[PDB]
Amino acid sequence: GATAATFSLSFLNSMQQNTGANNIVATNQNGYKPGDLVSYQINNDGTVVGN
Amino acid sequence: LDENRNLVNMQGMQLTGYPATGTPPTIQQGANPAPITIPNTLMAAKSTTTA
């Protein structure tokens, strides 16, 4: 009963040259499941980061 | 090598040096110093010119 994930996938900056074999070099997206605080600390920038 | 694939000391100071430019990249002794980074990106193939 959950709505489907509709997104845009980008394949730009890909290479078709003679690399010998085909292998994936990178993959990323901007979605995450809900989580809870596990730890945190303070960085030299002055910002507070919660993991 | 830092997270951004650049050479940094153990404290967080950005190592600087003579930038490498040209096709293929070479060494310039008059160019303004710039931070040194070492990307892992695949370099494009070059057409054969002289044999």
Tell me what the structure shows.
- This is part of a larger assembly, with 2 copies of chain A (51 residues).
- The first copy, chain A, has strands at 40-42, 48-50.
- The first copy, chain A, has a two-stranded antiparallel ribbon.
- With 51 residues, chain A is largely without helices or strands.
- Chain A has no helices and 2 strands.
- Chain B: This is Flagellar hook protein FlgE.
- Chain B: It is found in: Bacterial flagellum basal body.
- Chain B: It comes from Salmonella typhimurium (strain LT2 / SGSC1412 / ATCC 700720).
- Chain B: Belongs to the flagella basal body rod proteins family.
- It is classed as motor protein.
Question: How would the blueprint of this fold be written?
Answer:
This is part of a larger assembly, with 2 copies of chain A (51 residues).
Chain A (H helix, E strand, L loop, with lengths): L39 E3 L5 E3 L1
Antiparallel strand pairs in A: 1-2
Brief account:
Chain A has strands spanning 40-42, 48-50. The first copy, chain A, has 51 residues and is mostly loops. Chain A: This is Flagellar hook protein FlgE.
Overall shape of chain A: it is flat
CA(first)-CA(last) distance of chain A:
30 Å
Write the element-wise H/E pattern of chain A from the N-terminal end onward.
Answer: EE
Q: What structural class do helix, strand and pairing data of chain A support? A: little secondary structure
Strand order of the largest sheet of chain A: 1-2
Could you give the count of β-strands of chain A? 2
Helix content of chain A: under 10%
Query: Which pair has the most extensive contact?
Result: A-B, 6 and 4 residues
> How large a portion of the residues of chain A is in β-strands, by DSSP E?
5-15%
Number of continuous helical runs of chain A: 0
Structural Rg of chain A: 19 Å
Assembly state (oligomeric) = part of a larger assembly
Largest sheet composition of chain A: 2 strands, antiparallel
Subcellular location (chain A): Bacterial flagellum basal body
Organism (chain A): Salmonella typhimurium (strain LT2 / SGSC1412 / ATCC 700720)
Family (chain A): Belongs to the flagella basal body rod proteins family.
Protein name (chain A): Flagellar hook protein FlgE
